[PDB]
Amino acid sequence: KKGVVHGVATVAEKTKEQVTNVGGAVVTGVTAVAQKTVEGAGSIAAATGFVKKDQ
Amino acid sequence: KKGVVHGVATVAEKTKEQVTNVGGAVVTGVTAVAQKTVEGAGSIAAATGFVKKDQ
Amino acid sequence: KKGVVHGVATVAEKTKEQVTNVGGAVVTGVTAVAQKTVEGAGSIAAATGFVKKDQ
Amino acid sequence: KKGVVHGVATVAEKTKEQVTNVGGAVVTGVTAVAQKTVEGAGSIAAATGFVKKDQ
Amino acid sequence: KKGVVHGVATVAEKTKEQVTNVGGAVVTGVTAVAQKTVEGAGSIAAATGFVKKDQ
Amino acid sequence: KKGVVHGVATVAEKTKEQVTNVGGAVVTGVTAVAQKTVEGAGSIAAATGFVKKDQ
C-alpha cells in the first residue's frame, strides 16, 4: 500500500476508536465528576483535558 | 509498503485505540473525580492532562 | 518497507493503543481522584500530566 | 446533663454531619463512578457500601 | 454527667462527623471509582465496605 | 462523670470523627480506585473493608 499525508491524518484498519483533533476539544470517554463546593478566584477545580494560552 | 508524512500522522493496523492531537485537548479515557471542597486563589485542584502558557 | 516522516509520526502494526500529541493534552487512561479539601494560593493539589510555562 | 437511650441514638453538639441508620442504606457523601464495560454473571463491579444476605 | 445506653449509641460533643449503623450500609465519604472492563462470573471487582452472608 | 453501656457505644468529647457499626458497612473515608481490566471467576480484585461468611 501507499500513503502520503500532510497532517494531521489518522489512518488505520480494524480499529475500535479514532480521534483526530486540531483545535479545540474532543471528549469521547467516560467521565464522572462529583463535587460539593468550589470557591476561590480562580481555581481550576477539576480539569481532565485542558490547555491555557494568553498573549 | 510505502509512507511519507509531514506530521502529525498516526498510521497503523489492527489497532484498538488511536488519538491524534494538535491543540488542544482530547479526553478518551475513564476518569472519576470526587471532590468535597476547593478553595484558594488560585489552586489547580485536580488536573489530569493539563498545560499552561502565558506571553 | 519504506517510510520518511517529518514528525511527529507514530507508525505501527498490530498495536493496541496509540497517541500522537503536539500541544496540548491527551487523556486516554483510567484516572480516579478522590479529594476532600483544597486550600492555599495556589497549590497544584493533584496533577497527573502537567506542564507550566510563562514568558 | 443526663441521657438514657435504647438505641440507636446519635446525640451531639456543634456537629457538622450526622447519620443514623437501621436498615437499609444512607448515601450522603461525594461519589464518582466512571465505568466502561461490565460483563459476567454476576460480578459486583463497583460497590461502595454494600451488604448481602440470604436465607 | 450521666449516661446509660442499651446500644447502639454514639454520644459526643464538639464532633465533626458521626455515623451510627445497624444494618445495612452508610456511605458518607469521598469515593472515586474509575473502571474499564469487568468480566468473570462472579468477581467482586472493587468493593470498599462490603459484607456477605448466606444461610 | 458516670456511664454504663451495654454496647456498642462510642462516647467522647471534642472528637473530630465517630463511627459506630453493627452490621454491615460504613464508608466515611477518601477512596480512589482506578482499574483497567478484571477477569476470572471469581476474584476479589480490590477490597478495602470486606467480610465474607457462608453457612
Author numbering:
A (entry chain D), B (entry chain B), C (entry chain F), D (entry chain C), E (entry chain A), F (entry chain E): 45 to 99
What did the published study say regarding this structure?
Deposition of α-syn amyloid fibrils in Lewy bodies (LB) and Lewy neuritis (LN) is a common histological hallmark of Parkinson’s disease (PD) and synucleinopathies such as dementia with Lewy bodies (DLB) and multiple system atrophy (MSA). Accumulating evidence shows that α-syn amyloid fibrils serve as prion-like seeds for the propagation and cell-to-cell transmission of the pathological entity of α-syn. Several single point mutations and genomic duplication or triplication of SNCA, the gene encoding α-syn, have been identified to be causative to the familial forms of the diseases with a broad spectrum of distinctive clinical symptoms. α-Syn hereditary mutation E46K was originally identified from a Spanish family with autosomal dominant parkinsonism.
In this work, we determine the cryo-EM structure of the N-terminally acetylated E46K α-syn (Ac-E46K) fibril at an overall resolution of 3.37 Å. The density map showed a right-handed helix with a width of ~10 nm and a half helical pitch of ~68 nm, which is consistent with the AFM measurement. The fibril contains two protofilaments that intertwine along an approximate 2-fold screw axis. The high quality cryo-EM density map allowed us to unambiguously build an atomic structure model for the Ac-E46K fibril. This structure represents the fibril core (FC) of the Ac-E46K fibril consisting of residues 45–99 out of a total of 140 amino acids of α-syn, which is slightly smaller than the Ac-WT FC consisting of residues 37–99 formed under the same condition. In contrast, in the Ac-E46K structure, this segment forms a β hairpin and extends from the FC-C with interactions to the side chains of Q62, T64, and V66. In the Ac-WT fibril, α-syn subunits fold in a flat layer; in contrast, in the Ac-E46K fibril, β6 and β7 of the FC-C swap to the next layer to form inter-molecular side-chain interactions within the same protofilament. In contrast, in the Ac-E46K fibril, the E46K mutation breaks the salt bridge of E46-K80, which results in the breaking of the other two essential electrostatic interactions (K58-E61 and K45-H50-E57). Alternatively, in the Ac-E46K fibril, K80 forms inter-molecular salt bridge with E61 of the opposing α-syn subunit to involve in the fibril interface, and K45 directly forms salt bridge with E57 to stabilize the β-hairpin conformation of the FC-N. The exposed segments 74–79 of opposing α-syn subunits form typical class I parallel in-register homo-steric zippers to mediate the inter-protofilamental interactions. Thus, the relatively loose packing of the Ac-E46K fibril in comparison with that of the Ac-WT fibril may explain the decreased stability and increased sensitivity of the Ac-E46K fibril to the environment, which may associate with the pathology of this PD familial mutation.
